[PDB]
Amino acid sequence: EQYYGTGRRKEAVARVFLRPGNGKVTVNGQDFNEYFQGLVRAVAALEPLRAVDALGHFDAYITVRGGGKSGQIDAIKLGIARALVQYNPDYRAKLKPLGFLTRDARVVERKKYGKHKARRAPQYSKR
Amino acid sequence: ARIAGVEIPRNKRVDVALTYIYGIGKARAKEALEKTGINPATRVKDLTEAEVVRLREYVENTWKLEGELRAEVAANIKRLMDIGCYRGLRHRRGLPVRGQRTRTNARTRKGPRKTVAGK
Amino acid sequence: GNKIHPIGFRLGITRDWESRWYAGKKQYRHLLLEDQRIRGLLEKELYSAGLARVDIERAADNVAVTVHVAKPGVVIGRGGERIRVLREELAKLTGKNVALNVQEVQNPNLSAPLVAQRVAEQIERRFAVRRAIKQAVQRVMESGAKGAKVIVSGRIGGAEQARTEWAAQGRVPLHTLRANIDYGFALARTTYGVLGVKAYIFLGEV
Amino acid sequence: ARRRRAEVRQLQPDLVYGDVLVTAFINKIMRDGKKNLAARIFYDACKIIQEKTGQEPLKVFKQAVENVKPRMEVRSRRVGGANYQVPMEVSPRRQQSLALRWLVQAANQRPERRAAVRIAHELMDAAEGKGGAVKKKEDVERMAEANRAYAHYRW
Amino acid sequence: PRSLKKGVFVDDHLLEKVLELNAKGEKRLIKTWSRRSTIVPEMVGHTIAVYNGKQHVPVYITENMVGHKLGEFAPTRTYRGHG
Amino acid sequence: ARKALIEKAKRTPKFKVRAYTRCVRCGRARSVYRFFGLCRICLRELAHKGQLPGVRKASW
Amino acid sequence: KIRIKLRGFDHKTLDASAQKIVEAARRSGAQVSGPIPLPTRVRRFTVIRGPFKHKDSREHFELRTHNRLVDIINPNRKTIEQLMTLDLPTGVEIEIKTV
Amino acid sequence: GKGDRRTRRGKIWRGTYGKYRPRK
RNA sequence: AACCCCCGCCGUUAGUUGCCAGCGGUUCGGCCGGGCACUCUAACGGGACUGCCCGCGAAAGCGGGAGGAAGGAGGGGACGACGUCUGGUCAGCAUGGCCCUUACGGCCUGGGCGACACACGUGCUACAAUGCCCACUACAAAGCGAUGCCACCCGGCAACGGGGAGCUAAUCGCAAAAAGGUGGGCCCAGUUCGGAUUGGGGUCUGCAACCCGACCCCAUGAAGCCGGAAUCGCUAGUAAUCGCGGAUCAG
RNA sequence: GCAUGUGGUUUAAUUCGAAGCAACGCGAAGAACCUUACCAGGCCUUGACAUGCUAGGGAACCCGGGUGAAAGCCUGGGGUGCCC
Ligand SMILES: [Mg+2]
Ligand SMILES: [Mg+2]
Ligand SMILES: [Mg+2]
Ligand SMILES: [Mg+2]
Ligand SMILES: [Mg+2]
Ligand SMILES: [Mg+2]
Ligand SMILES: [Mg+2]
Ligand SMILES: [Mg+2]
Ligand SMILES: [Mg+2]
Ligand SMILES: [Mg+2]
Ligand SMILES: [Mg+2]
Ligand SMILES: [Mg+2]
Ligand SMILES: [Mg+2]
Ligand SMILES: [Mg+2]
Ligand SMILES: [Mg+2]
Ligand SMILES: [Mg+2]
Ligand SMILES: [Mg+2]
Ligand SMILES: [Zn+2]
């Protein structure tokens, strides 16, 4: 048995697998902490799980590529998010007006010509 | 203790304390603790006298340091002076020697900024 | 000098490249250099034939020079006499398989660069500056085009004060991509100097 | 603005405790986005505070804020020939910034050698009534009053 | 500076006027336009004219002016001041 | 483009260091792409006629 | 068995070209693993719109190398000639592999 | 430092490798 | 304004050189069998309209919400109207005209655009403890490369040199991402801050590094403890901060 | 402090142009000679380049020496195809 979700956020992609059992999380083999060490947004990825009562109800098989661990953790989170409608198409009620089903459509805007870094422009006295 | 003709910073780490000579930097130092095998981590104040001399001879006799080195260097240019060459004419007039631009900038080599009047 | 070239906008949007090949990094540099000889000789001569759009499709060292032109029998001569003179004068420059065709400019007012030329000619021809440009446009919504516009742009009529002129009609909408418009840059030469000319035609939204 | 007032930035409530105030502080520590630092800066100040004056570090924060939150300010302005520094009351949120703003700004002006340390002290010292935190609060209620001479030009 | 894995450098036409007037125990002023070359110990005591832009400059060659290139003894421009 | 100075770069030189490109179409070697044998003025000017295959106008 | 590599400029011909090819390797005696979209490559050119001084106004061009790749499993002698009697796209360059 | 050459990031900045930045 | 591209969701065609959820084997390396699920990979389509609800309103619109990946144009790009400043360049090219044409035209070696009592305009690194430093430890996107990218191997403290496997490039390589993480050293110091300017030693490109190069190692360790009056940028994945890349080009 | 443009000076020349915002890391998305318009020297004169005209010799062409800073110049030899 396995329930899967599609998790994606800002040039980083994450894959989620929800089996019934414990609450151990393997993200690219490694434990949830041996991959998200002294980092605080870490334990936040699990949030979409704990607003329906099930940390200890399911296991976590994980895979990620791209981005940084935040942008992964947002995707991991968005993965456990989607993953729960494939188990309960009724959990959908609880985790949308709670906001956990959405692609953070936010994205590193393009660097523009004439502008040091897109928005930033060049300083000028003697105006 | 004292070496090269200078009393090195007591209370401080060994490795740092030897930089404080005119013959030694970061490297030539921590390699003289390699080649006299005393823990670089410890303080200059906690040695043995045994472990004092042992760095004294090696450091002093091998390299050229202190008074002798600015002396050699303040001669090695004194050399490049009377030579008539490009580089000597610079150490004299106090303009940079390493070819850097000289319109704008180039301060630390000329002194401070002596201001005039445009037109 | 504020705006943009119309053709170079619809690059594979509502137009097409003339030279349509492939190429490697080794080849593209030289290969193209060639086309700009092909199109320098081909032009320089064919002028009083009214030459328009010059395709140069390419396979394995087979060049494929098509040619759209006002007057196919001033490319030809009598019988097939003068087209041969050139068809090799190109394989004389390439060193390979010149397949130099011919394709008539059916309706001549309904293709810009021609329109541009005859006007730039008419300016070289010491004609009535305005009326040139008026009738220019005139004929274009007379042949049946959606939109017309000509831009005479020199020291005009022989004047020392450099100005510019023009007129137009119909839809001229170069901010609609999906509107096909043809640009014509000409470039008259008269005793007082040099007087570039422009011409835009709309045919239709697609 | 000039088209309407902004809605104000709806922050992520704290990951550990849960206060939205805790958030805005952590960001208001943070420099150059280096947020995994300022989170530790915060959560070591709660190890110090829970263990130097053994109560709930979280409660002291709430109080260390109420106590630097000014209530009147000098919303300066002009007539037509010279301009007057002018007493004005303060918004609900405007407090919550200047609170945390100043709490930090003091902590960096504190003399200690350590990061979460100069937060810990300037968190007790705020919720006492001393330290640079509260000094400034009572300083622009003081320039609210020792400048009350033009509370008719107030807007 | 100049690779040691590739030895010193001197121009041929210039070295030619040196070890022919060396091989005849004489000394004359040489006129060449190379500056790009490294003086060698078999030129010491020669009178050598090097060029800067417009002028051949007097450079009699002594000892410890050894491995330095020629152009170090032939200033290229003129700077005395601004007024 | 001083005419003879397209030619001081056409023919092969005394030593291989002196090998500086130039534009086939105008003879400005100041900003030239050794992929078009062309400069920036040209490359547009031409690209604006679609006379360089696959050269699209960019946007993202 | 026999693998093809199409490298062109359009996205149009390069899809067209490779789908004529994909029909006469089915009728002619071959199962086939389909038309393959590949890691396209971009060479871009950022250039000063102006002749002279006006630098910070700039134009943008992208030359898009488009890579296609189709595999023929079970290549017949009813086949191989059917695909040298199919050749017809103009801006494309074809190549033929075999391991 | 960063304009400093004999160091960790100061190499990386220049782009270079030396005794103070290895090749593993 | 829309039609074009990029990014956001999803469906159709597709399974290599990419991918690994289940099963078989496993030199534990998606390594092999097998599969193309999902990630990706490019081509085409779907979808957002004030459509729904209460309210406000003659209407257009507006405010709050339900559903939705996206909500009132979702973010970003290309896109610049009739005209002005006789704005810009005869130094890309084009050309009226005045002007030289055994000379301003042409070839050449060397010298110069880099000079330096100063002044402004732009940026880099700093002045450091939210840090500097040495180890071990993770997570990127984009682009280039068969006249080149150069895995490893050996020599050297090192730049690099020698030998040499792979790659028409999702298959091989530049490639170390860096701030972050673990562990430890520094303890307010002109400092293990800072990294100028110098002395000497070498490597490389190149006919050739004196003018006038970059890089390595050693020694030198300057100004500056966050900056006068004035003044600049940015309204959200922006500002700041950290690394990678490409063009040009032997360097 | 250094990097880069710039003003002013200096220079045999420091080649050019940019001029309030909208000139100033801008023409330079790569100045050691090259680039190179500049200056000092050694030089070339249908010329590094085009389509030719007339008189006289020469197939094109390829190899070497001498002098030289290089260019340049004086000069030895090999060669003698195509059309009628
Ligand atoms: Mg960024
Ligand atoms: Mg700028
Ligand atoms: Mg010209
Ligand atoms: Mg070059
Ligand atoms: Mg340092
Ligand atoms: Mg396979
Ligand atoms: Mg298995
Ligand atoms: Mg528009
Ligand atoms: Mg003006
Ligand atoms: Mg310059
Ligand atoms: Mg080794
Ligand atoms: Mg090597
Ligand atoms: Mg300090
Ligand atoms: Mg805005
Ligand atoms: Mg970079
Ligand atoms: Mg001029
Ligand atoms: Mg020069
Ligand atoms: Zn050009």
Swiss-Prot record, chain A:
GO biological process: translation
Keywords assigned by UniProt, alphabetized: Ribonucleoprotein, Ribosomal protein, RNA-binding, rRNA-binding, tRNA-binding
GO MF terms, alphabetically ordered: rRNA binding; structural constituent of ribosome; tRNA binding
Disulfide bonds, paired cysteine numbers: none
GO cellular component: cytosolic small ribosomal subunit
Matching PROSITE patterns: RIBOSOMAL_S9 (PS00360)
Subunit structure: Part of the 30S ribosomal subunit. Contacts proteins S7 and S10.
Function: Part of the top of the head of the 30S subunit. The C-terminal region penetrates the head emerging in the P-site where it contacts tRNA.
Family according to the record: Belongs to the universal ribosomal protein uS9 family.
UniProt xrefs under PANTHER family: RIBOSOMAL PROTEIN S9, SMALL RIBOSOMAL SUBUNIT PROTEIN US9M
NCBIfam families membership: PRK00132.1
Protein name: Small ribosomal subunit protein uS9
Organism: Thermus thermophilus (strain ATCC 27634 / DSM 579 / HB8)
Gene encoding the protein: rpsI
UniProtKB/Swiss-Prot annotation, chain B:
GO MF assignments: rRNA binding; structural constituent of ribosome; tRNA binding
GO CC annotation: cytosol; small ribosomal subunit
Any Pfam family hit: Ribosomal_S13
InterPro entries in the cross-refs: Rbsml_uS13_C, Ribosomal_uS13, Ribosomal_uS13-like_H2TH, Ribosomal_uS13_bac-type, Ribosomal_uS13_CS
SUPFAM superfamilies: S13-like H2TH domain
Gene Ontology process terms (BP): translation
Transmembrane segments: none
Annotated region (Disordered), positions in chain: 94-119
Keywords: Ribonucleoprotein, Ribosomal protein, RNA-binding, rRNA-binding, tRNA-binding
Taxonomy, superkingdom: Bacteria
Subunit-structure text: Part of the 30S ribosomal subunit. Forms a loose heterodimer with protein S19. Forms two bridges to the 50S subunit in the 70S ribosome, contacting protein L5 and the 23S rRNA; these bridges are straddled by the 5S rRNA.
Record-linked HAMAP family: Ribosomal_uS13
Function noted in UniProt: Located at the top of the head of the 30S subunit, it contacts several helices of the 16S rRNA. In the 70S ribosome structure it contacts the 23S rRNA (bridge B1a) and protein L5 of the 50S subunit (bridge B1b), connecting the top of the two subunits; these bridges are in contact with the A site and P site tRNAs respectively and are implicated in movement during ribosome translocation. Separately contacts the tRNAs in the A and P sites.
Family: Belongs to the universal ribosomal protein uS13 family.
NCBIfam families: uS13_bact (TIGR03631)
Protein name: Small ribosomal subunit protein uS13
Phylogenetic classification of the source organism: Bacteria, Thermotogati, Deinococcota, Deinococci, Thermales
From Swiss-Prot, chain F:
Name listed for the protein in its UniProt record: Small ribosomal subunit protein uS14
Chain positions recorded as Zn(2+) binding sites: 23, 26, 39, 42
Keyword RNA-binding listed: yes
Subunit structure comment from the entry: Part of the 30S ribosomal subunit. Forms a tight complex with proteins S3 and S10, which cover it.
Record's keyword terms, sorted: Metal-binding, Ribonucleoprotein, Ribosomal protein, RNA-binding, rRNA-binding, Zinc
Keyword Glycoprotein listed: no
GO process annotations (BP): translation
Record-linked Gene3D superfamilies: 30s Ribosomal Protein S14, Chain N
Sections of the chain in a coiled coil: none
Annotated source species: Thermus thermophilus (strain ATCC 27634 / DSM 579 / HB8)
Family recorded in the similarity comment: Belongs to the universal ribosomal protein uS14 family. Zinc-binding uS14 subfamily.
Cofactor binding remark: Binds 1 zinc ion per subunit.
Purpose: Required for the assembly of 30S particles and may also be responsible for determining the conformation of the 16S rRNA at the A site. Binds 16S rRNA in center of the 30S subunit head.
Cofactor(s) this protein cannot do without: Zn(2+)
Any GO CC annotation of this UniProt entry: cytoplasm
Highest taxon of source: Bacteria
GO MF, any single term: rRNA binding
Swiss-Prot record, chain H:
Disulfide bonds: none
MF term (GO), any: rRNA binding
Positions of transmembrane segments: none
One GO cellular component term noted in the UniProt record for this chain: ribonucleoprotein complex
Keyword Ribonucleoprotein attached: yes
Keywords: Ribonucleoprotein, Ribosomal protein, RNA-binding, rRNA-binding
Ranges of biased composition (kind: Basic residues): 1-12
Highest rank taxon of the organism: Bacteria
Residue numbers spanned by region Disordered: 1-24
InterPro entries (alphabetical): Ribosomal_bTHX, Ribosomal_bTHX/bTHXc/bTHXm
Family membership noted in the UniProt record: Belongs to the bacterial ribosomal protein bTHX family.
Subunit note: Part of the 30S ribosomal subunit.
Function per UniProt: Binds at the top of the head of the 30S subunit. It stabilizes a number of different RNA elements and thus is important for subunit structure.
Name of protein: Small ribosomal subunit protein bTHX
Species of provenance: Thermus thermophilus (strain ATCC 27634 / DSM 579 / HB8)
Lineage: Bacteria, Thermotogati, Deinococcota, Deinococci, Thermales
